Amino acid sequence: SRSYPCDEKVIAECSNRRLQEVPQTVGKYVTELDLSDNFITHITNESFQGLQNLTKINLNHNPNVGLNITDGAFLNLKNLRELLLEDNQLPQIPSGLPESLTELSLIQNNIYNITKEGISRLINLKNLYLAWNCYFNKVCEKTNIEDGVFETLTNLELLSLSFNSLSHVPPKLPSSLRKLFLSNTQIKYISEEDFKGLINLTLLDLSGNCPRCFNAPFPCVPCDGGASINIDRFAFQNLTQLRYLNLSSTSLRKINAAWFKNMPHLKVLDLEFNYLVGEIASGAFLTMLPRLEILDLSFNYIKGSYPQHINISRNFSKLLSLRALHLRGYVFQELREDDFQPLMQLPNLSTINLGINFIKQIDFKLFQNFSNLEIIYLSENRISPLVFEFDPHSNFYHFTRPLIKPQCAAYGKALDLSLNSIFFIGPNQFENLPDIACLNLSANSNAQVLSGTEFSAIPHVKYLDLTNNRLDFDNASALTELSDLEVLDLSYNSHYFRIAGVTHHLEFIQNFTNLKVLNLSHNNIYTLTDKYNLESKSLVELVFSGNRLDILWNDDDNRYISIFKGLKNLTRLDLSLNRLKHIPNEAFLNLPASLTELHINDNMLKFFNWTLLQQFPRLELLDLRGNKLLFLTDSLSDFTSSLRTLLLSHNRISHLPSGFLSEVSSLKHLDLSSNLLKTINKSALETKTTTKLSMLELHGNPFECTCDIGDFRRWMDEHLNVKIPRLVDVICASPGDQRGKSIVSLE
Amino acid sequence: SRSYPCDEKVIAECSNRRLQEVPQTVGKYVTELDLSDNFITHITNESFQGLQNLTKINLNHNPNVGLNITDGAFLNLKNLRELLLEDNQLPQIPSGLPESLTELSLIQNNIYNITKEGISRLINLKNLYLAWNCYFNKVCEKTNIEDGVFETLTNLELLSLSFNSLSHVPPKLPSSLRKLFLSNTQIKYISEEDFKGLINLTLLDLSGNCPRCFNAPFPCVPCDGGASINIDRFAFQNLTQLRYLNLSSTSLRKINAAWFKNMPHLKVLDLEFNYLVGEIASGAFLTMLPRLEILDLSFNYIKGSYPQHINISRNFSKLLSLRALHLRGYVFQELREDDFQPLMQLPNLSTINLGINFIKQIDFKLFQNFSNLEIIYLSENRISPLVFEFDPHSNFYHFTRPLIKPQCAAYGKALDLSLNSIFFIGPNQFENLPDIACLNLSANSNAQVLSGTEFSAIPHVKYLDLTNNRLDFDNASALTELSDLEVLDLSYNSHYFRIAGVTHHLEFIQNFTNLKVLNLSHNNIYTLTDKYNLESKSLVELVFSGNRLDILWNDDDNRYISIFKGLKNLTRLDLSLNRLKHIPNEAFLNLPASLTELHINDNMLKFFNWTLLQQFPRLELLDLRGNKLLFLTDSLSDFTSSLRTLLLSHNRISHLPSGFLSEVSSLKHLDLSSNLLKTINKSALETKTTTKLSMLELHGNPFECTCDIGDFRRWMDEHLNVKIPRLVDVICASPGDQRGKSIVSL
Ligand SMILES: *[C@@H]1O[C@H](CO)[C@@H](O[C@@H]2O[C@H](CO)[C@@H](O[C@@H]3O[C@H](CO[C@H]4O[C@H](CO)[C@@H](O)[C@H](O)[C@@H]4O)[C@@H](O)[C@H](O[C@H]4O[C@H](CO)[C@@H](O)[C@H](O)[C@@H]4O)[C@@H]3O)[C@H](O)[C@H]2NC(C)=O)[C@H](O)[C@H]1NC(C)=O
Ligand SMILES: *[C@@H]1O[C@H](CO)[C@@H](O[C@@H]2O[C@H](CO)[C@@H](O[C@@H]3O[C@H](CO[C@H]4O[C@H](CO)[C@@H](O)[C@H](O)[C@@H]4O)[C@@H](O)[C@H](O[C@H]4O[C@H](CO)[C@@H](O)[C@H](O)[C@@H]4O)[C@@H]3O)[C@H](O)[C@H]2NC(C)=O)[C@H](O)[C@H]1NC(C)=O
Ligand SMILES: *[C@@H]1O[C@H](CO)[C@@H](O[C@@H]2O[C@H](CO)[C@@H](O[C@@H]3O[C@H](CO[C@H]4O[C@H](CO)[C@@H](O)[C@H](O)[C@@H]4O)[C@@H](O)[C@H](O[C@H]4O[C@H](CO)[C@@H](O)[C@H](O)[C@@H]4O)[C@@H]3O)[C@H](O)[C@H]2NC(C)=O)[C@H](O)[C@H]1NC(C)=O
Ligand SMILES: *[C@@H]1O[C@H](CO)[C@@H](O[C@@H]2O[C@H](CO)[C@@H](O[C@@H]3O[C@H](CO[C@H]4O[C@H](CO)[C@@H](O)[C@H](O)[C@@H]4O)[C@@H](O)[C@H](O[C@H]4O[C@H](CO)[C@@H](O)[C@H](O)[C@@H]4O)[C@@H]3O)[C@H](O)[C@H]2NC(C)=O)[C@H](O)[C@H]1NC(C)=O
Ligand SMILES: *[C@@H]1O[C@H](CO)[C@@H](O[C@@H]2O[C@H](CO)[C@@H](O[C@@H]3O[C@H](CO)[C@@H](O)[C@H](O)[C@@H]3O)[C@H](O)[C@H]2NC(C)=O)[C@H](O)[C@H]1NC(C)=O
Ligand SMILES: *[C@@H]1O[C@H](CO)[C@@H](O[C@@H]2O[C@H](CO)[C@@H](O)[C@H](O)[C@H]2NC(C)=O)[C@H](O)[C@H]1NC(C)=O
Ligand SMILES: CCCc1nc2c(N)nc3ccccc3c2s1
Ligand SMILES: CCCc1nc2c(N)nc3ccccc3c2s1
Ligand SMILES: *[C@@H]1O[C@H](CO)[C@@H](O)[C@H](O)[C@H]1NC(C)=O
Ligand SMILES: *[C@@H]1O[C@H](CO)[C@@H](O)[C@H](O)[C@H]1NC(C)=O
Ligand SMILES: *[C@@H]1O[C@H](CO)[C@@H](O)[C@H](O)[C@H]1NC(C)=O
Ligand SMILES: *[C@@H]1O[C@H](CO)[C@@H](O)[C@H](O)[C@H]1NC(C)=O
Ligand SMILES: *[C@@H]1O[C@H](CO)[C@@H](O)[C@H](O)[C@H]1NC(C)=O
Ligand SMILES: *[C@@H]1O[C@H](CO)[C@@H](O)[C@H](O)[C@H]1NC(C)=O
């Protein structure tokens, strides 16, 4: 039978299915099993029956906004390798866990007592996550770790105790440890004996102990007087394998060089949210880190201080392996050439992160002198013209996304000037720069008329982001100096397009021989001056969303009838959010014959002429989601041989015509979800020549469940080739007796 | 029995009800019937037969998407005065219209032929609207106007022919004409005999004839060469009563002063979208308008020309009665004191409009030397730091809305600097200005830290609009120099608020003795430094929408639970668009006790503690719309004696608890629309006292039309005083036979 309620594909995915009990309906060879997000309020020896090969179970957030597991529920398994209990409001570690477990996550529970009766028999444990049980203003109790609880686990590699009230590094920790997470534990003092016996440690996280609480975006309790963490100079002595060390928000004003004496493999050092300005300026510790790749010094600013310049010690010149340097929230006015002199001969330093410094001015010519910089991140500054709340599985101190969009960075050397003040680009702005492939000028409040001379000193820009400005496109030669331009993002430039009475000029689009992708979204374009057509021989993708094609294509106006025809290479066109009630036949027929993909979604369409699809022989995806459409042609096979994906969700369709679904041979993905369908006839499904369809989305329709759905329910069993996602969401709305029942639950 | 399908109140509003045809169910006392925006295809002599009392009928836009009207269909109606048929795709003026008609609207149809058989029989016509039949790129025919068609309408005071192709003014127009609209008619030439007989004309609209087509946001056909309209020197001679004249977009280059020799009453003169820069500079015609109140000179710019200065003729000093001058779209770089000299002795000139000129700099002291300027409109320029597509019923050339928001302007002198470049306000920025009550700094890209000195030169601002900037609130004394400040709008300053690691200070709010209305909307406020509370002893209304209260009030954080409690005078509070799935009990309890009106609408709320309304004895309106709420209490009368309006629309409410409609004695308006209610049973109706509800909104609920709905239908008949609106939209879901039908119809 069709897999229900789980999607099996060997893993079974039951997540977020509103299950009130563990499924007895589970498969046979099911191994990975995810029950997360369901409503299960009870667990037992009965609920899991017994099964075969299960190598994993995810019980997370059962139920959803606790859980009762009786002593010895998971008991007879012996196969159970990994078990995830997060967010179930557990007052205690469940008594009677299996001996098989190598992975256990108790994260985000009420467990205040870690005891031998819950743990010490777990000898096979590899990774154990106890994080986020007692923290912030949560009413909770100090965490008691029984003496030698972890001592019994001689295979233990990772241990995470973070965001719990500890006060001391637990003693008698197994020497097999690789990674140890102590973050935000209220530990004031680290002694010589705390970490002494762990010679295999590659990671130690002490962050958030004695935090720097000024301007905290969370409840923050400092050590007495706002004191630094106290780490004995021999604390790290036997730590020879250490790679990652997280000292963030330890309130450090001084860093003992002797900490790093026995730590030759050190790679990533996190010093964020401390008071390190002095140490950054002088910094004996910098001499001790020859293999260090990533150094994060972010948010060390002196409160209320705004110095003219940043003070970097010459000892930075001794990190020979340095790859990225993060200095955010240092807070200084100006970056001069000599200030970065110690970084310039570092062979591997490809990334400098200057975000959120309120920097007014920079001598850009310094970046040239650097050995090889790939990413120059200046976002969120003052640069002006040249003259539960926290993801427990994520880094708490800084975001992990790429600094620069990967699609932009792949082109080459990237300069990100976003969220600054450069409101006018003057003739010398970009002089003395490296050869910039990827440039981000977004959110500079730029109101200027780009004339074609502005980027001439960096003529090689491949990918240009001008989004969220005020640009006034009054010149046909704008941006044409960039010959190699490939991607251009003009989004959120609506300021001038909105005013009927100012001139508007898009003609520059045609000059580029390499332009591939162009984003005109959210510009409110309803009118252009003298040239109504967009023309490019190169252009591949055009994003036109958030404009007014309802105005451009108004029935009484023929000037814009051809607006997209001149893009002769175009395979992808996004027409969404143009407030279209209908598209004039002529206008639709004037869309490029080359189109493989067309998005009309989230308009007001009450009419669509299906016949017109005959003029688009390469059309693959047609996206009509989020409109008002009632009508479906019964003829589709006559208008397209190429259609693959058809997305109709969030429309008004109450009727599938006889011979609709299966008569298009090329159709794979059909999306009927969130429509008005009361049923599906035997006539809708035929099938003379078999359907290539691999996916059919029916969820969120008011199916009337009587014997009239019998044929569809029959069709589903006869085609298991066709998957209908979210079976738990394909639901009888009628009659009153069957309400809420899944369509496959009907007998 | 309540009225249906119409809402009778005597007029019937039947509009937008999806009617297939004229209802028979309309009351006989009914005078005016509005059938606009329905699905009715066919009008015949039996359509309105049951109604002889009809005076005014609105058939506009039927069907919604042609309309077939038989000959003499409306004939049997002896009392019909006003007949509005617009957007009906009518091929002809309907035959045999009743002679009683005073007002006829044929706007926006396919009628290309104006004939005696349709028009000339109606002697009582006052207003006749023919506009927008053949225009733009529409496929349409040139308009044939039969010689003498209007000659027989001796009562006709208004004729609108605009947006048709006339090619010349119709001869033989009646002398009763007051207003004549000829806009966009393709009339090249106005002769001396075109208007010679209209001695009662108050308004003449000649606009859009020989239009200026450069950068037009509509299909535009210029006269050959782009020539000016040709108006004979004597064309206006008998027009002595004219008040309004619209010459916009006639491609005028010179204006013949002689045209105005005979019109001593001229009040409003529209010259927009012409070639008039030369005239604006010399301008003999200004000698001729001592009674002109309103002069629109907008968009006379020379294409491609960005002169340093605007050049205003000294003859502007001859307009003694001028109230408002509109100079948009002249396009010049710098405004100097000397440039406005001729305007400065004009006693009544309250409004100056400089919008969309790309002005770089203004010598601001010039505005004082004017007699009295109430409104200085500088919006949409380059000012930097100091060193239906077309609604046929509206004005085509400019918007008619007030330049300044009336709520601001009412405080006093207004300066609107919005949509400019003043990104940093310097010490002298506002020097030598008049005493400014109403100030708009919106969308200036301002990133500065307001420190408390920036407004020192205009300390009397009572309404300040700071919206749509980059403002960095890093200083506790910000804005405190304005001690009379009543209204402060901070909307859309999110730039810095969204960065967790920069300091944020809202403490300045408390200083104001007179602060009434503060709008913090759409700032994405999730974190503050030090002071976590908003405090004011004055503030009446706080708009907090579009922030993150969901983060501020997060269960693990105690810091913001008092956030609004220190606003002691607070009555209206808007919590909408905060992504709230629920409000902690103590945080709700910490809302100001004085609230009359509380909006939590358009959040994610899954939960509401109704018992908490006990602490709000003044609470009148509670707006819960657009949430997830399932629950309502059966005890509500225990928790409030004060609740008047309760808005529950767009939630999931499966059932009403027992006697809910009779529960609260203060409750007048209850909104249950757009919910999951399948029935209202005997229980919701069961209680000792009676419903005092004057309104109950049920529309959009999936009602079950089986017999058990009958009980609620009796409750309806019992109380006719309880208004349930949109009854065509209160609709049976189950079962299939009754589906699509109003529950009132079963
Ligand atoms: C102090 O500084 C140290 C740095 O030394 C930080 O240590 C890191 O902590 C983060 C956050 O917990 C870790 O990130 C997480 O890693 C998990 C493990 O992944 C490893 O193994 C898997 C195999 O399953 C690989 O896929 C992966 O590449 C790694 O090899 C991931 O499971 C986590 O994934 C997260 O996102 C994905 C979605 O993209 C989800 O599927 C997950 O559920 C989860 O949300 C996450 O990436 C990181 O590994 C730690 N570093 C090291 C070297 O171990 C501390 O976090 C920091 N302390 C504080 C308080 O900030
Ligand atoms: C202006 O308009 C352009 C539109 O072109 C936008 O830029 C594009 O942004 C879209 C995101 O909407 C990008 O498309 C996405 O790329 C992701 C990254 O792919 C890279 O890496 C993967 C492997 O990890 C490679 O397969 C790929 O070749 C790239 O190297 C994909 O992961 C995304 O997939 C998502 O949708 C697909 C289906 O399409 C699913 O299969 C995925 O599960 C996932 O949901 C997606 O394809 C696109 O790359 C961007 N183009 C450019 C030129 O940058 C701008 O964002 C827009 N500006 C604004 C302000 O909105
Ligand atoms: C050339 O220049 C002249 C100015 O001299 C313009 O003439 C004006 O044209 C506009 C647009 O038609 C007229 O505005 C409309 O007036 C209607 C009549 O209002 C009278 O009656 C009402 C109530 O009885 C009074 O309140 C009012 O004072 C008048 O006595 C209104 O009904 C119209 O309102 C419409 O829109 C509004 C707002 O959307 C709605 O509230 C209404 O329901 C309705 O839909 C509208 O206000 C104006 O009256 C004309 N001026 C004069 C003095 O007569 C020309 O328009 C201009 N030419 C072009 C082509 O732009
Ligand atoms: C930041 O927040 C502020 C404060 O809320 C917003 O400013 C308010 O905006 C609202 C509308 O959004 C204004 O309310 C409206 O006022 C109109 C003016 O009414 C005056 O004049 C009429 C008669 O001429 C009198 O009846 C009245 O007492 C006033 O003297 C009303 O006409 C409006 O009423 C209509 O709509 C409302 C529903 O909104 C109904 O209640 C009415 O029955 C009627 O249908 C409306 O009440 C309010 O006056 C503004 N306050 C101030 C101080 O200006 C800002 O807009 C906001 N900023 C941003 C960017 O959003
Ligand atoms: C300060 O200046 C700004 C910018 O000019 C003013 O904002 C503008 O206000 C008008 C009038 O409210 C807005 O137009 C309106 O749109 C609404 C929303 O649909 C519509 O119902 C009205 O018919 C009206 O046309 C306009 O959008 C808005 N412009 C921008 C860019 O926001 C603001 O009013 C000024 N402040 C004061 C105190 O006057
Ligand atoms: C240029 O900089 C802007 C602003 O920093 C980047 O915009 C961010 O993009 C990511 C991905 O879309 C989002 O998570 C953020 O919401 C955006 N920030 C804001 C506030 O707009 C943009 O991605 C950058 N462009 C390139 C080419 O990397
Ligand atoms: C408003 C009339 C037509 C005009 N459009 C523009 C524009 N888009 N940018 C400018 C920049 C500088 C100077 C003038 C202009 C003008 S003048
Ligand atoms: C990032 C550390 C804390 C800071 N917050 C701000 C702020 N809101 N505005 C500034 C304006 C100028 C200079 C410095 C600042 C800083 S420094
Ligand atoms: C720099 O990195 C490269 C690999 O990217 C490596 O071969 C080289 O040894 C590194 N240089 C230093 C000094 O670490
Ligand atoms: C574009 O700008 C340059 C520099 O101002 C100017 O020389 C050129 O004439 C402009 N081109 C257009 C289309 O006006
Ligand atoms: C059309 O698009 C493809 C994909 O970008 C590209 O290979 C080809 O060069 C383009 N053709 C032209 C003429 O630009
Ligand atoms: C605010 O800025 C002013 C500058 O005039 C300064 O004097 C004051 O100290 C600042 N206030 C605070 C408390 O930050
Ligand atoms: C409280 O509100 C009213 C609003 O009209 C106002 O009259 C009164 O002065 C305010 N009280 C204080 C102390 O500001
Ligand atoms: C409502 O809030 C108060 C807490 O102050 C409590 O007495 C009552 O139980 C709450 N109701 C619910 C359902 O939580």
Tell me which H or E stretch contains B497: helix B494-497
**At residue B496, what are phi and psi to the nearest 5 degrees?**
-85, -35
Alpha carbon A24 to its chain's center: 35
- Quote the minimal CA–CA distance from B570 to chain A in Å: 27
> Inter-chain contact B389–A501, Cβ cutoff 8 Å?
no
CB A604 within 8 A of CB A628: yes
Calpha distance B585→A680 (Å, rounded): 48
Q: Looking at chain A from residue 187 to 226, which residues have their Cβ under 8 Å from any Cβ of chain B? A: 214-215, 217-219
Of all protein residues, whose CA lies closest to atom 3 belonging to ligand 9? Answer: A348
What is the sign, positive or negative, of the torsion defined by CA atoms of A620, A621, A624, A630? positive
Find the radius of gyration of the CA atoms of chain B. Answer: 31
DSSP A41: -
DSSP 3-state of A670: strand
CB A57 within 8 A of CB A35: yes
Determine the number of helices (DSSP H) and then strands (DSSP E) in chain B.
Answer: 7, 38
| Nearest to B142, CA basis, from B120, B166, B121, B158 | B166
Tell me which H or E stretch contains A408: helix A406-409
Calpha distance B435→A220 (Å, rounded): 47
Annotate A706-742 with three-state secondary structure. Answer: CHHHHHHHHHHHHCCCCECCCHHHCEEEECCCCCCCE
Q: Which pair of structure tokens corresponds to residue A72? A: 């010895």
DSSP 3-state of B287: helix
Residues 6+ apart with CB under 8 A from A156: A125, A126, A128, A150, A174, A176, A177
Of all protein residues, whose CA lies closest to atom 55 belonging to ligand 1? Answer: A395
Residue A233 CB neighbours (<10 A): 12
Tokens 């209490």 sit on residue? B633
Tokens 């209260």 sit on residue? B549
Calpha distance A386→B586 (Å, rounded): 53
**At residue B567, what are phi and psi to the nearest 5 degrees?**
-100, 100
Which residue type occupies B126? K
Which residue type occupies A159? L
Domain ranges of chain A: 1-747
B381 to chain A: closest CA residue: A447
Residues 6+ apart with CB under 8 A from A249: A207, A208, A211, A212, A272, A273, A274, A397
| Nearest to A320, CA basis, from A350, A295, A289, A351 | A289
**At residue A312, what are phi and psi to the nearest 5 degrees?**
-105, 125
Cβ contacts (< 8 Å) between A135 and chain B: which residues? Answer: 556
Whether domain B1-746 has CATH 3.80.10.10: yes
Annotate B195-260 with three-state secondary structure. Answer: CCCCCCCCEEECCCCCCCCCCCCCCCCCCHHHCCCEECCCCCCCCCCCCEEECCCCCCCCCCHHHH
Alpha carbon distances (Å) from B689 to B284, B679, B722:
78, 22, 15
> Inter-chain contact A502–B470, Cβ cutoff 8 Å?
no
CB A246 within 8 A of CB A221: no
Find the radius of gyration of the CA atoms of chain A. Answer: 31
**A497 and chain B in contact, CB less than 8 A:** no
| Nearest to B506, CA basis, from B462, B493, B459 | B493
DSSP 3-state of A587: helix
CB A366 within 8 A of CB A338: no
**A740 and chain B in contact, CB less than 8 A:** no
CB B180 within 8 A of CB B159: yes
- Which CATH fold would you assign to the domain A1-747? 3.80.10
Q: Where are the beta strands (DSSP E) in B614-679?
A: 621-623, 645-647, 669-671
CB B230 within 8 A of CB B256: no
Query: Is the distance from the beta carbon of residue B467 to the nearest atom of ligand 4 less than 6 Å?
Result: yes
Tokens 């589903």 sit on residue? A716
B390 to chain A: closest CA residue: A551
DSSP A567: B
**A551 and chain B in contact, CB less than 8 A:** yes
Cα torsion through A46, A48, A49, A52, rounded to 10: -160
Cα A149 to middle of ligand 11, angstroms: 65
Long-range interactions of A548-553: CB distance < 8 A, separation 24+: A548/A524, A548/A578, A548/A579, A549/A575, A549/A578, A549/A579, A549/A580, A549/A583, A550/A578, A550/A579, A550/A580, A550/A581, A551/A526, A551/A527, A551/B389, A552/A525, A552/A526, A552/A527, A553/A580, A553/A583, A553/A584, A553/A587
Which residue type occupies B417? L
Which residue type occupies B507? E
Cβ contacts (< 8 Å) between A136 and chain B: which residues? Answer: 556-557
CB A128 within 8 A of CB A149: no
Between B215, B356, B529, which is nearest A529 by CB? B215
Calpha distance A522→B246 (Å, rounded): 36
Burial of A180 (0-12, 13-18, 19+ CB in 10 A): buried
> Inter-chain contact B557–A218, Cβ cutoff 8 Å?
yes
**A558 and chain B in contact, CB less than 8 A:** yes
Tokens 């900037």 sit on residue? B469
**Residue A329 Cα: closest atom of ligand 8:** 1
> Inter-chain contact B217–A136, Cβ cutoff 8 Å?
no
Calpha distance B48→B32 (Å, rounded): 12
Tell me which H or E stretch contains A497: helix A494-497
Of all protein residues, whose CA lies closest to atom 11 belonging to ligand 9? Answer: A321
Cα A145 to middle of ligand 1, angstroms: 25
Tell me which H or E stretch contains B408: helix B406-409
- Give the residues surrounding ligand 5 with Cβ less than 6 Å away: B 379, 401, 404-405, 408, 416, 418-419, 440, 442, 465
| Nearest to B495, CA basis, from B466, B525, B519, B465 | B525
Query: Is the distance from the beta carbon of residue B78 to the nearest atom of ligand 3 less than 6 Å?
Result: no
- Give the residues surrounding ligand 7 with Cβ less than 6 Å away: A 449, 472, 474, 496, 501-503; B 301, 306, 329, 331, 356, 358
Count of residues making up chain A: 747
